[PDB]
Structures are given as C-alpha cells and as structure tokens.
Subunit: 269 residues, 6 copies
C-alpha cells in the first residue's frame, strides 16, 4: 500500500509554495509549452482528501489522475518538429541557485532530480526496480501485463501529463516515485537520430525533467529503454550520466554500472 | 469451419458491454491520440447475437463481417507523422490494476492480451496459425488468395477499425480470434527506422494493442511480419517479447521459439 | 489481333455483377480512395459494341480508354505521404470468401489475381512476356519505343486509372491481360525505403492489386522492375512471392525462378 | 556554324502542327501532371520560318532563341509538394506510339525518334564528343559555364525547361538534329529520396517521358545527362538509362566507352 | 563567488549604449533573419547597475537573472519552416568590424573580442576546466543538470536563448568575463539535415554570427559546446569550429588537448599558457 | 586603398548597357526570383559620386551597400525547398553568345565569370587570397574577426543581395572583386545531399553565379568552403571545375591545383 505519514501532510504547504514560486515550461522539437502548476496542487489536495477517507493507506488504483481530476492536462496552433528554432525560441528548465534537498533513495544523500534505470530488453530493469529499489509509488506506463500491475503501489497512467502530475505531486510530498516505462514518449520522439542511434533532444528532455524534479524536491527513478544497437548502449549510458542526477545500468539481471550526484559528491560505482 | 455461438458467449454479452463502458480508450501512433467509439463494438456484438438467434448459432464468417452487419464501420472519432510530441501529447492504453482473465488458447493459463506470430516470409506462420493454433475466428487482412479464404471461420476485413471491432467484439465474448495479417498497418507505418530496421512506435503499438485486449478479456493471435533483414529477425523477436503477452517464432515450417505470460508465470519454450 | 469469342460476350453480365456487388477502394501512403466501378462497366460496353461493329477482331489502338471514354478517371483536398496513419485510416482490398476462378494462363490452374514478372534491367522481362507468356492484351505504360508498340495487341495508356480500367475490364471477360510496365507507379512511390532498398507499401500495393483481380476473376501479369541493388533482387523476389498469386524471375534473357498459386496448390519452380 | 532551313523543313511545318494538335500531352515529376501548351510550339515554328524567309534560309542560333521570338515562353499550363500522395495527384506517363516511329540518320543510322543520353563523369569528354563527333544542327546551351561552344552560330542560349522543350519539339519535329548541353539545371534540382545508384527513381521515368514526347513528335534529340553519382556507380546508372532511352552514349577519358541505339535494324549494343 | 562592479564597469555603460545603438543587428538560422532589440540589453544594463548601487558594488548571480530584472526577456522581434527556399528568406550574417577589435586578458592574453568555444566529449572535463582553470566573472548556467557550480554566487540560471544573449552582450560589453555552461539547449534543438561530421552546417555559421556579435560589442565570452558527434569525428568538428570562433579549446581526459586564440600577437595554436 | 581610375569611369555607361540589355533571375530549390538591375546601377552611381568627393581613393567601409543605399534588396508567397520542380519551373542564367571579356586576374587572359578558391579548413585559402591573389575589393562575409577586416579594401556585408551588388556593381567597372566567404549561403543550403556529401544545386548555383559575372564582364574570386569529408574534397573540386571559369585548390598553406578558362584555352596546373 501507499501510506501517507504526517511528514507528507506537513509538506503539502511547502509543495504549493515551490509550485507557485517558479513558473515552468517544457520544450522538445516544437515551441515551449507552460506547465499548469494548479493541476498538480489540485491533485495533491485530492490525494490528501482520499487519504483522510482511508486510514492514511491508499491504493495506487484510487490515486490515478483520471479518477481524481476532471481534466488531466498539465500543458497549456500546431507546430512541426522541423520549423525555425528562432521562430519558436529555445527553453530549458532553469537550475536551482540553492542547495538541492537530499534524499535516501535511490542512493544515500542523492540530490533531488531524476535517475535513469537503463539496460537492454530483459536485462532486469523492472526486477531491479521492484526488488532492489522498492519504490513507494510505481507508475506503470506503456508496459505489457506483468506481476507489477497487481501491486497496490501501481498507478496506471496513459498520458505524459499524468506522469508529471504523479511524479511532481507525490514526489514533492516526499514519496519515492518510479516510472516503468518512459517508452511511450521515447518511441514517439520524432526527429533525425544523432550519434548513438537516438535523437539528441532525448538528452535535453532528461536534463529538463531532472531539473523539474530538482526544483520541486522530487526523487524519481525512470526506466529509460532506448531502441539502440546492443553495443551502442555503453555510449548512450555515458551520455545519460551527463544529463541526469542518477544513472543505473542493468546487464544479465544484475546492476552493471551506477552514477549518483550526492551531498558527498558525484559517485561512480 | 463454422463459427458456433454457445450459451457461454450469450452470458458474456452483458459483461462485455460493462467492460467497454467502464474504461474510455484511445490509440496513438505518430500523430495525435484518437478515441475509440466503444458503442460501435457493442452494436456489432448485438448484430452477431441477433443473427446467431435467426440461424442455429452456426454462423458463417462471411455473414459476420462488420461491413455487412454495420451501416458504418468507423471506431476512431489532419496531423503529420513529424509534428511536436508536446503539441499532440502522448497516449498509451492504461494497464489493468486487477489480475487479467486467463485463457486456454494460444497457451494454457495465458493472460488476456495479444500474441505475435513472427517469422520470415514462407517460414510457416499461416500454416502454424490454421493447423497448430486452430482459431475460432480467422480475420483475413492484406493477404493474397489462399486456401484459408474458403474457410467458414474466415472474415474478410479492409480497415484497422474493422480489425479492432471483430477482435474486441468477438474476443470479449470468449472467442479465439486470430489476424492474418496486420501487414497493411505495419507496411504503412511512416517514420524513421530505429535499431533493427524498424520504426520504434511499432513496439509501442503492440503493447497498446495487447493492453486493449487485456482490458477487454480478449485472447488474440496476430501474425506480425514486418520488413526486416533475415539476420535481424532474432533481435526484433526478442524486443517483441517485451511488448506482448505471447510471442511465437516460425522457421522452416515449424515453431522455433515461444513465450507466454501465464498464471503459472512467464514461460520461454 | 484481339479477338472477342462468345465466351467473352457471356461474361459481360457476370462482370457488371462482380463490379456492382463489392465496392472497392485503393490506398498508398495517403488516404483510401474509392474506385468508380461504373467507368469499368462503360469501358466493357464500348469494347463489346466496337467488337460487334468489326468482325470480333479488334485493334489494341482502337480499345484505348482515352479514345472510347469521355473521361478516364477511376478514382473519386491533398494529403502528404507523411501523414498520421490514424488520421487517414488503413485500407486493404478484401479477400474472396468463395473459391477464386482458375485460369490456364500464365500457368495451368492458376487462381485469379496478379503475377509479377521480375528482373534487373535487361534480364529479359519484356522478351519473356511477349515470346514465352504470349498475352491477349498488352498494356504499354512507362516504356520507351520498342517493337512491342507496333503489335495489334498493344494498348497505350498514360494513367494508373487507364491501367486498372483495361486490366479489370478486359481481364474479367476472360482476356489474358499484361502490363509492360508499372514503372511510372513504382518510380513515383514516395516514402522511406524499408529492408531491401524499397518502400514497404510496395508489397501492400501488390497484394491489394492482386486481390482486386482475384475479386473480378482477372489473370494479369505485371512486369515489376523497381530500383533495387543487383544482389538485393533475390530478397525482394522472396517478399513479392508472399504478396502475389504468381511470381516470375528473369535473368540472362531467361526464366530464373517461378511461383504460382494453383488449384493443385502453391508450385515453386 | 549556321542553321540552314531546307525545303524538307518547310514541308514538315503542316505535319508538325498536325502531330501537335492530334495528341494532347502532359508531364509529371513528383507533383501533379501538368499539360503542355502545344500552341506555343506552333507559334515558335511560325516565327522561325518567318525569320528564315527574311534571311536566306541561313539562321543564327542567337536569333532563334524563344525569349526573343515569343512574348511568353511558358509551355506548362495551387502549388504541390514532392512528398504528396501518388493517389491524390494520379500518375501520368506520356503515351507510346502505336505506329512505327520516324527514323533518323543522327545520332546513329536508322535510329527511331526519341531521346539519346550522352553520359559520363565530369571531364570525360561529353561536350567534346557532342560538338566534334556528333555535329548537331542546333546546340541548346543550358546550365553550362562559358565555353568555346557558346560562340558558335548553332548555339541557342536558354534559361527555362519550357524553352528547352520548345526548341527541342519545335525544331526537332521539322527534322533538325537538336542537342542539349546540358540538362543539369533540372537534374540538380530533382527533389526526392535517392534510390539505388545514388539517384532519384523519377529520373528514369522522366527520361522515358521525354523520349516518348520526342517519339510522338518525330524528334531526334541528344541530351548530355550528367547527374551527381559516385565514380563506380556510373556503370549501373548507364545500364538503367539504356532501358529508359532510344539512344545511350557513355564517355570515358575523352573517348566513347559504350553505345546503345534502338534502330529499324534493331537494338544495337556497341 | 560574488560578482563585483568596478568603476571600470560604470565608465563602460555609455560606451556600451553607443555600441548597441550604432549598429542594427539580426540573427538567422534556417528560417528568416530576425532583428535583435538592442533596447532590452540597455534596459538590462541599467537594472544591473541600479541593483549594484543598492548593494555595495558586489552582486549575486541569482539577483541579476533577466527574468527577475526585466518584465519581458524577449530580444528577437508569421512562422517559417527550417525547409523553406533560401532565396525567399535571403541570407543574413552579422557584419564584421572595420576597426581593430578591443583586446582582453581572458580567456587568453591579448585575445580579440568575440566567442571562445570550449569543446569536448561528455565527461572530458569541460565544466571542470571552465570553473577551475578559466575562473569566469559571470557563469551562465543553461540546460545542465544539478552540479556544484549551481550553488556559486557567480551562477546566473537562464531558460531562453534571448536571456543568454542579454547577459552575454549586456555584462560582456561592460568588461565582465562571461561564460555559458551549457549551450546544449540550442545545439540539441538544431533542426536540419546533418552535414559532414554528423552535425548541421548552420551550427558553424551560428558560432561565427555569435562571435562577430561579441566582437562588435567588445565582449569576451566562453561557451561550452558539447556536440552529439562520434568519438572519431570530434577532431574534424574542432578543426571546423576553430575556423568559426576567435577562441577554441578542446578537452580530453580532464585536460586541455588543443587551443586556438586570435590575439593582438597573432593566431596562436596550442600555446604554452596555463588558463 | 580602393582607387577609381579613368578606366573605371569610362566603364559606367557600358555597365548600365549590360545590366539593362539582359533581364536576369536566380533559382535554388524554390521558384526563380528576378534580380533588380536598377539597385546595382544606383550602387555604381553612389560609388562614383563618393569617389568624386574623395581623391579617387575610397575606403571599403564607405562603399558598403547598407551605408550608400536606403534599401539593399536585389531580389523582387513563400515556397518550400521540397516543392514539385514542374510547379516552380527551372531557371539557369543564360550564357553569352559573344566572346567573354578577358581579364589579367586571377589568371592571364581568363574569361569573365567566377573562380572558386577551395580547400579544407586552415588549408590557407584566406592567406592565398590576400597574399598571392591581391584583390582590389575584398568582401568580408560570414567570417570571424581576422587581420583582413582592418584592411581598407575590406567591405563588410550581411546579406546575399549585398554580395551580388558589390560583385556585379564593382566587378563590371573592372575591379578585381573577391569574397571571403560564401559560407553563410553554403551552410544554409537546404536539401538532400547528393554524391560527395553535398546538395547537387550547389554546382548549379556556382554555374549561375559564374554566368551572371560572364554576362556583366566581372572577374570574381569566391572562397568556397562547404562541409565535406577530408577525402571527398578531391571529387568535389573536380565537379566544381566543370561549374566555374576558375578553380584553385589549397593544401597546407600552398596552392595544390589550378584550372582557368582563358583566351589561350582551358589550363590545368
Ligand atoms: N529472452 C529471454 N530468455 C530467458 N530469460 C529471459 C529473457 N528475457 C528476459 N528473461 C528473464 O527476465 C529477467 C529480466 O526481467 P525484467 O526485469 O522484466 O527485464 P526488463 O525490465 O529489463 O525488460 C532476466 O533476468 C531473465 O531471468
Ligand atoms: N521459396 C519457397 N520455396 C519452397 N517452399 C516454400 C517457399 N516459401 C514457402 N514455402 C513453403 O510454404 C510453407 C510456408 O507457408 P506459409 O504458412 O503461407 O508461410 P508464411 O505465412 O510465413 O508466409 C513452407 O513451410 C514451405 O513448405
Ligand atoms: N546491357 C546489355 N548489353 C547487351 N545486351 C543487352 C543488354 N541489356 C539487354 N540486352 C539484350 O536485350 C535482351 C533483354 O531484353 P528486354 O526484355 O527488353 O529487357 P528488360 O528486362 O529490361 O525488359 C537480352 O537478352 C539481350 O539480348
Ligand atoms: N581534371 C582534368 N585534368 C586534365 N584534363 C582534364 C580534366 N578535366 C577535363 N580535362 C580535359 O577536358 C576534356 C573533356 O572536356 P569536356 O568535353 O568539356 O568534358 P565534360 O563535358 O564531360 O565535362 C578531357 O578529354 C580532357 O582533355
Ligand atoms: N564515465 C566516467 N567514469 C569516471 N569518471 C568520470 C566519468 N565521466 C566523467 N568522469 C569524471 O568527471 C570529470 C569531468 O567532469 P566535467 O567537467 O563535468 O565534464 P564535462 O563538462 O565535459 O561533461 C572527468 O575528468 C572525470 O574525473
Ligand atoms: N590546426 C592548425 N594547426 C596549426 N596551424 C594551423 C592550423 N589551422 C590553420 N593553421 C595555420 O593557418 C594557415 C591557414 O590560414 P587561413 O588562410 O586563414 O586558412 P583558411 O582560410 O583555409 O581557413 C595555415 O597555413 C597554418 O599556418
Ligand atoms: Ca520491463
Ligand atoms: Ca501468410
Ligand atoms: Ca523492356
Ligand atoms: Ca560539358
Ligand atoms: Ca558539465
Ligand atoms: Ca579563411
């Protein structure tokens, strides 16, 4: 189950302050799109109200945004991925001038941001996540029917808006949020593939997502599975390390490599 | 050869309508998410049952084609394949929080979803499907004139809307539905080819199709034959295993490899 | 000459029937487009009247659609080849529930559909077509001035609409129709080339064309010579066999390989 | 150097007008089929004959350029992209001739009417072979830098594709031996995905459509075709072009490497 | 860690305003030339000086971010595609300086005004070289993950390209040693067909246009440029970048592998000078 | 300095006759665009008027078009680079029926047109141009701050319109005009790269530019440095020789190869 502590209740006000304090946007190959902070606040309030209906114990099924919110839109005519970058402009989510809030998960003293759980298909990513990492909230997206779907920690989403709502919303409150998988986004990323058989904007998106979590004191682990050649995975993992607060590589059911940006410094394996 | 409607099928009609109304679904490829009109599937089920009532329950595949039973066969209610992912949004069909309904076909105790019948051209996919699999309903799409077209189990469709209508409609009632083949969709998949000489959205589509069947308690076998190199088929089959409930590989008229997600767990050969 | 037998006259009524009974469309990378059946019927009527005015012995020049019909259009604002597959939908011409009508040409007991006469430039396709296959009607499209143009069996077309009119129109009556060539359609196929250096929709088009002939009891031989590498022709011929009722490979002025789907079964060489 | 108008040319004027009016033609590339205004070609022929009459039959290539003789040089009669559905634009190929083509003595004996492609790498001797070995009656110069051939009285300097077809169909139908050096402005602007041989497939369709356009109007034209292709891939492309033209000439190190001509005595390879 | 405003900076304010008004500039990429609103840069300089005055000369990078000081951060003043005819859009390059450019002591001695490009593969030590060896006065942080450099009082966190140019031209003209870590948000969103070296050709034109923009406004800027390029094509890309900037530094294995600086003493390739 | 001789003053009338006599246009991948001859005439008049106010000694800074003309536009709604060639038409600047005016620069007896100074980055193109070629007017465009910018012969431009104005305007008068560089145009050439890793229209543009100078009796040297592989430069240089009146290749600070079309014939090294 997903148990709501007094620590989570005390973070509600702070979470609302963090969201209102900084206006954020996101961009991919098109034009920068603003994130409606209000929706995340509304989600937190809905989760707290339901938590109150129960004994603080929540079922992942009951906290899905499609059930709690009338509208699940976070992004507020249509632009092509091959338009002039000077007509659309360029946006990256700004960094934190202050020291980021540290966490005990996925690693000790890790800064707020995003961790990428990498590896080839069947390398043990989902296994490593649920057995070794053991998240408080397990977001399930674009993955076939598995044993992890029967878990009361599992929250089934359909859109990118829903992913960010649950990640920012619950992550800000102090929950250890995880996403399995981020394949719906990755496999629909349109554009010319750069060095490593993957679009360059993929690395920019990971940085923008990481900083979005750093700003809202979230500690999120995302399963990032790329359609990349068996030997080109090492290059891509090195490139992802420069774009995320955390990075975990899986090979043959075990953890091959690690990288974490902590209060004790950047730790490699 | 005939398609017989048992009392078991009649008793599932109400449940099928209940599953369809309970969850609103959509589908996305490289464009924008498009909603699926559930009502059309319900209307199809009612038309099949009405005809089964007039006949002895012994129905001919020719008489149950949607173009004949329905006035309009549309299930989806103009965007380029190279448009910003943030302007269209991303959609994946949500997972099942509950345990999926098990089936005896194509394998014992297999969960509801999709099975991909893979193999090179002339590897014996169509032969394995009809002789070894023995499906109740055989959907024939984008295939040249063969002996399987003269079968009373054969239902000849033209559109993707029709495929989903027959698959969800009859599959929900408990019928063992099969599609030979899904080639018109695969060969019209526009986009930049990823690792393995195939567009990445192909794997996302298989998962979205699988989850669509998992949600509506369907057990469907689709023969998937995409344009891929003779040696690159092993990589693609491994990737498809991570995107479907079932996977069957054909080589020299026989079954080379198998993967099934059952109540007894994931079974490899 | 092109001689009209009583057997052809007796098929006129059956041809109008077949054409009215099933509404057909065609799709490539755009949106599905309906085929106006009336135009084919109008063409048959104009050919029969001219055959009745002359001695039954017609000249290919006199039966060209541009001469017999006021308008040659078969297809009834503008869509790009890179448009979302979900916005246009997917269409494949439906298969035949009944047994297809057999023919003695290009092979004994062959089912109605299309035969692809394949080979590199100067492999002997056009020689094999005119000397070994001996067609009744020879449609000449996208080819330079050759000896075959002076033939009384030769009918010179300009559009794809005209090709289908003569193929379906005369083919349905029992004539052995051949197209030399289909290069104006192949070389103008816009899209990203799949495995084998050729667009995947090419194989779907051959199946759709074949089934169009299977439905209207036609036996058509099309010379198909797409821009493909000298060594990649074997792979492409292999994929074409899985997309057509007949397949003939030319090399060094002679027949290299054959495949025919007959009443006695699929025959390979 | 001069362009002389014989009685044979004068006697063909009526026949040329008949050939043009008899068959309506179009052209297509990656967009939609575009009709060719036959009237413009007839108007050009009339202007050339009138000037030939004022002179002694002896004409200067400079004086017979379409931009000088016609007020409007347009042959093709809102805007479509090269990546549009083939089914929405339709497909057009210029129809073949049911009758025997009109044979010529140039570039080869008994060669049928149509187009000949003068191929070869850059500096292989295409322009040299064209002017020294071929000896054309009319030399169309297009998209080529300043050379000795521009000072020739046979040289007619054009700017558009419309102008090329006007001079090719107009003068070729009358019986003149017309040549184009070169067709690089069309080839280098051919938009589309490059097929096998590092060149767009529609290139081969265009050569056939151009060939048949000349076959129908009994024109004997030699076009120097030099597309951007790899040094070793030229052999493959030349073989493919042979299947798309009435004539084909390959140049290598200033000399003629290979030949192909479709004649009344049959197809002749070297 | 702090950003100190000297009398030298105060004396440059007028000079900077004149430089901006004297020459009208634009920028182009694959679309239509877009004009740069000089007024916004002047307004930013005035806001920085006014705040420097309220504080004791010393300023915090957080307080000088354009989003905080200006009501609108737009520098570029309907929508054109990256694949439009070059003749329908025309071509624009920022013009060169007819006079001798203002020399600087940073990033190299006697260097001309313009842009310096700090190259290297990922984890080659670009950010380390920038902060330890180069020591910039103002550190612009853009599209980079949470690092130790973000806690620095020299760090100014931006989000747009408009903001980058405002801080670079605005503070750089006054005499500050401005650095950008990273320029990746721009590089990773460069739409177009990749040329030789697995990178769009307009990338090199943009570096030259950015360099000349700084040469005209007497700025000395160091931009860290991380290219999505294969391990073996980095040498080719660097050679090409050297021909497009006033300064270029290559990083490999935590150290400086190669340098190029256009100084008053001439073009110096791989000099004996610690940064 | 830039000195105006009596020879230049005597050419003013002839330059107007040349510009008025032939209407010209330019095309790239879009539609043909007319060149407004009047603007070039206006520029010549402004240069001569200023040369008069001076002692015949002009500063390159004072003769820049942005300073002398109110509007710098030469080309007189918006078309895509991937539009049908038949809808835009094709334009090449026409050749000269007469013998071209000869020059003593960059080579003895060279015909009027364009010379391409080629070579890898840092091969010594700019060095060869200013030390060995010694041009009368050095147009500086899209190049970084160098010693050549402080030269009184240097004229700094921003647009392609400005380049052609100075090249045609001053070149027609007899000045030895050079451009360092043509990179702003070359690095913004949109389209599919042909053989040699460069767009085919690049070679057509060089010929069109060369013929534009041949028609207006100009002798211009352009630094052409396109993004091409280290080994592919030899192929491209050979192709450029077939597209220009002059061609110079640079390697390791020295001149590797030369080609000039003179009154004494085509001279190779
Ligand atoms: N093709 C295969 N054959 C055998 N076992 C496999 C195969 N693919 C995966 N497995 C098993 O599944 C485990 C990985 O499961 P999982 O965590 O779901 O992988 P991932 O999330 O990376 O796709 C492996 O350690 C192995 O035991
Ligand atoms: N090229 C070939 N040569 C010989 N036999 C072939 C060939 N291609 C297919 N076959 C025969 O057809 C069988 C496969 O039929 P089928 O099930 O229709 O294949 P698929 O559906 O995979 O295309 C093979 O087992 C073999 O007996
Ligand atoms: N490159 C060539 N060299 C020599 N003869 C050739 C060549 N190409 C074709 N031929 C001749 O033409 C014949 C093939 O003719 P044809 O059927 O028209 O070819 P295609 O396969 O292109 O339709 C060959 O048998 C040979 O006699
Ligand atoms: N790179 C070169 N080196 C030496 N001579 C050359 C070179 N390129 C061309 N030539 C000379 O020019 C002749 C070819 O001239 P030309 O007919 O104009 O060629 P093309 O029209 O095929 O481009 C060759 O036979 C040779 O004498
Ligand atoms: N894969 C790695 N394994 C070990 N150390 C690494 C790795 N990647 C980077 N480092 C360390 O980080 C340093 C580079 O840090 P940084 O300046 O942030 O690089 P950059 O800015 O070029 O991405 C290296 O000198 C090395 O000590
Ligand atoms: N990577 C380098 N290493 C050393 N010297 C170089 C390098 N690149 C250029 N140079 C020097 O600069 C000279 C070339 O200068 P320049 O004319 O500006 O070249 P270009 O115009 O072709 O880019 C060379 O002759 C050499 O002395
Ligand atoms: Ca998994
Ligand atoms: Ca099959
Ligand atoms: Ca042939
Ligand atoms: Ca030539
Ligand atoms: Ca860094
Ligand atoms: Ca230079």
């Amino acid at each position: 189950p997903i148990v709501v502590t007094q620590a989570h209740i005390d973070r509600v006000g702070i979470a609302a302050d963090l969201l209102d304090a900084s206006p954020v946007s996101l961009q991919v190959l098109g034009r920068p799109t603003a994130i409606n902070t209000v929706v995340i606040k509304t989600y937190i309030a809905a989760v707290m109200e339901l938590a109150s209906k129960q004994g603080g114990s929540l079922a992942g099924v009951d906290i899905r945004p499609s059930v709690l919110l009338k509208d699940t839109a976070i992004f507020t005519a249509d632009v092509e991925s091959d338009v002039d970058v000077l007509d659309t402009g360029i946006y990256s989510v700004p960094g934190l001038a202050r020291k980021p809030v540290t966490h005990r998960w996925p690693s000790e003293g890790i800064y707020s941001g995003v961790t990428a759980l990498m590896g080839a298909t069947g390398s043990g990513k989902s296994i490593t996540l649920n057995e070794k990492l053991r998240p408080d909230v397990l977001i399930r997206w674009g993955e076939v029917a598995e044993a992890y779907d029967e878990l009361d920690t599992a929250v089934h989403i359909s859109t990118l808006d829903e992913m960010l709502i649950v990640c920012i919303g619950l992550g800000a409150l102090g929950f250890n949020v995880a996403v399995d998988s981020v394949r719906p986004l990755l496999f629909r990323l349109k554009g010319a593939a750069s060095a490593g058989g993957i679009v360059a904007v993929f690395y920019s998106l990971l940085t923008d997502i990481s900083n979005l979590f750093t700003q809202y004191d979230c500690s999120v682990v995302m399963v990032v599975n790329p359609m990349v050649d068996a030997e080109k995975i090492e290059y891509v993992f090195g490139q992802v390390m420069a774009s995320t607060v955390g990075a975990i590589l899986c090979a043959d059911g075990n953890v091959s490599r690690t990288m974490f940006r902590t209060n004790k410094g950047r730790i490699f394996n």
